[PDB]
Amino acid sequence: TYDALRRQLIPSFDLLYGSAVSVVAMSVPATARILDLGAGTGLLGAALRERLPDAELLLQDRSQAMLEQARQRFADDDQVAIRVADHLDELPAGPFDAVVSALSIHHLEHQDKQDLFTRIRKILRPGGIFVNVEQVLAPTSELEKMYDRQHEAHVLASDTPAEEWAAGRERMKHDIPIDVETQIQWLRDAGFTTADCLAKDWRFATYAGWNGS
Amino acid sequence: TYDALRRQLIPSFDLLYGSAVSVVAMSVPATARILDLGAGTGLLGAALRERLPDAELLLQDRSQAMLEQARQRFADDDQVAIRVADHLDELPAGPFDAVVSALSIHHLEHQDKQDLFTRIRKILRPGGIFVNVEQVLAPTSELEKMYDRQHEAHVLASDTPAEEWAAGRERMKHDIPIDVETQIQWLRDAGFTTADCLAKDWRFATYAGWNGS
Ligand SMILES: Nc1ncnc2c1ncn2[C@@H]1O[C@H](CSCC[C@H](N)C(=O)O)[C@@H](O)[C@H]1O
Ligand SMILES: Nc1ncnc2c1ncn2[C@@H]1O[C@H](CSCC[C@H](N)C(=O)O)[C@@H](O)[C@H]1O
């Protein structure tokens, strides 16, 4: 039921999640070591495992309640660990072929977003990839209003239980998002050699950066 | 026939054309004057008319055989004119509230792309909007290969008659695409106050610029 509600709250869910799965599957070996930052119930891990049965996934998140949902989903998988940690805590050593994230880093202050991309590159092997599926701000307040009408169109066409869209609205007034080109530039500053926006549906986008390639 | 085959050849058709319709509908009045550049059989114009029944449409294209198809689709539509004209020819005076384009400007050399953006802004009213649904090149040759596997992934999942993808591959030898951020910078250079990439699916992207807003 949780899986259906995310599809309802996020436009072009398949396109954007899928694009994170595909860019990782064309960047990394079948036996890659992957870190999922703020994995929550571990949906992005799920999509990755569906593509890459032989990959070793570390799921990390500050919320023990969210990771117990992840643990449930991955009950009978041997190649899946869990790590209780804040994004601002020392990252695991790795190294990792891939670090992936969905809808988490927009909860950090801008400066801590720049400090995280630099620390993520340190635990990435050469040729490794960083993939973010992210809530982005429009570049002007006029466009932000258009972004909002488009997100709200998708939610209502999806027949979202109102109680759940009202909650959605409230979680969103603590968010600290930014335009997708500011974030992508920060990848370049942190030293990723190549950074690109792969797919986008107004307020949501999949971007990636590569360490060497 | 034709309409189904475009859905087959073009990932995220509904998202990409749809985002062109929706950014125009939130940018211009119901009675806006719209120019469709390289309108072809005039599928973008159709989408726009479905959304804006009181808008005045001018469909322009160098190919008279394409515009014959457009004339057929708009047989019974009184607010629809046609203009046979090259992108390099003097644009109609207008003014227009919107100038829209789908899968045409990528056929120009890069400097004639920059020159067209500049001439297009001159025929737009203040606060008018330029929208391009476009074939874009990745920023690296390695990513270009990935964009190509994603476009080829959709075509085969869409059960495309091979004879038609064959043709597709050849027409693509005369294409002069460039990455989406270069093009969007050129809107800013040509004097649009705001430019943004709305939606994207690897090799296809919807972007826009605003003349004053
Ligand atoms: N500073 C921080 N450090 C670690 N995790 C954080 C965090 N701020 C938020 N989170 C976690 O980030 C998650 C964002 S919700 C999205 C979760 C999941 N990846 C999905 O896409 O469906 C939550 O589980 C939340 O607990
Ligand atoms: N230099 C040019 N001037 C005008 N139209 C051009 C052009 N180069 C290509 N075109 C036109 O651009 C079209 C490319 S196909 C895209 C057709 C239509 N816009 C759609 O959404 O499907 C063809 O109709 C072709 O004649």
Q: CA B117 to CA B189: how far, in whole Å? A: 9
Collapsing DSSP to helix, strand or coil, B125 comes out as strand
In this structure, the number of other CB atoms found within 10 A of the CB of residue B13 comes to 19
* Secondary structure element (H or E) that encloses residue B78, with its range: none
- CA torsion sign for B168, A13, B3, B110 is negative
- Residue A102 · residue A70 · CB < 8 Å: no
User: Domain extents for chain B?
Assistant: 2-210
Q: Token pair for residue A130? A: 């960083």
Q: Which ligand is nearest to the CA of B42?
A: 2
Q: Would you say the CB of residue A69 lies under 6 angstroms from ligand 1?
A: no
Q: Closest Cα of chain A to B176: distance in Å?
A: 20
Q: What is the largest CA-CA distance in chain A?
A: 49
B104 annotated ligand binder = yes
- CATH number for the region B2-210 comes to 3.40.50.150
Q: CA B39 to CA A25: how far, in whole Å? A: 37
Which residue in chain A is spatially nearest to B203 when comparing CA positions?
A: A198
Q: CA A39 to CA A146: how far, in whole Å? A: 29
What contacts A201, CB < 8 A, 6 or more positions away? A11, A12, A15, A16, A150, A154, B15, B19, B199
- A102: DSSP letter: E
Q: CA B4 to CA B15: how far, in whole Å? A: 15
- Residue B104 · residue B38 · CB < 8 Å: yes
Collapsing DSSP to helix, strand or coil, B142 comes out as helix
- Residue B16 · residue B175 · CB < 8 Å: no
Collapsing DSSP to helix, strand or coil, A201 comes out as strand
Residues of A with CB under 8 A from a CB of B: 12, 15, 19, 22-23, 26, 138-140, 142-143, 146, 149-150, 153, 180-181, 194, 196-202, 205, 213
Q: CA B134 to CA B199: how far, in whole Å? A: 11
Strand partners, A133: A102, A206
**Environment class of residue B182 by beta-carbon count within 10 Å: exposed (0-12), middle (13-18) or buried (19+)?**
middle
Q: Would you say the CB of residue A7 lies under 6 angstroms from ligand 1?
A: no
**DSSP assignment of B100-118:** EEES-GGGS-HHHHHHHHH
- B56: DSSP letter: E
Which residue in chain A is spatially nearest to B25 when comparing CA positions?
A: A146
**Tokens 């994170």, residue located:** A20
Technique used to solve these coordinates: X-ray
Q: CA B196 to CA B185: how far, in whole Å? A: 9
Q: CA B183 to CA B188: how far, in whole Å? A: 9
In this structure, the number of other CB atoms found within 10 A of the CB of residue B57 comes to 26
Region of B102 on the Ramachandran plot (φ > 0 left; ψ -120 to 50 alpha; else beta): beta
**Tokens 């209780």, residue located:** A84
- Residue A96 · residue A34 · CB < 8 Å: yes
B179 backbone dihedrals φ, ψ, rounded to 5°? -65, 160
Q: Which of A12, A22, A142 sits opposite B15 (nearest CB)?
A: A12
Which is the closest atom of ligand 1 to the Cα of A103? 16
- B55: DSSP letter: -
Strand partners, B33: B56
Task: Label each residue of B18-44 as H, E or C.
Answer: HHHHHHHHCCCCCCCEEEEECCCCCHH
Q: Which amino acid is at B203?
A: R
Q: Closest Cα of chain B to A31: distance in Å?
A: 20
Encode B86-104: b = buried (16+ Cβ within 10 Å), e = exposed: ebeeebbebebbbbbbbbb
Region of A198 on the Ramachandran plot (φ > 0 left; ψ -120 to 50 alpha; else beta): alpha
- Residue A105 · residue A116 · CB < 8 Å: yes
The packing angle between helices A64-73 and A43-51, to 10°, is 30
Q: CA A112 to CA A162: how far, in whole Å? A: 33
Q: CA B141 to CA B159: how far, in whole Å? A: 27
Q: Token pair for residue A195? A: 């950074």
- A106: DSSP letter: G
CB contacts < 8 Å between A and B, how many? 63
Nearest to A137 by CA among A207, A189, A202, A206: A202
Topology of domain A12-140+176-210 in CATH is Rossmann fold (3.40.50)
- Residue A35 · residue A124 · CB < 8 Å: no
Q: From residue A97, give the alpha-carbon distance in Å to each of A25, A26, A106, A127, B153.
A: 11, 12, 23, 8, 24
Cβ distance A198 to B198 less than 8 Å, yes or no, reads no
Contacts by A61-64, CB closer than 8 A, 24 or more apart:
A61/A37, A61/A85, A61/A104, A62/A38, A62/A86, A62/A87
In chain A, residues with a C-beta closer than 8 Å to the C-beta of B26 are: 146, 149
- For chain B, how big is the Rg over CA atoms in Å? 16
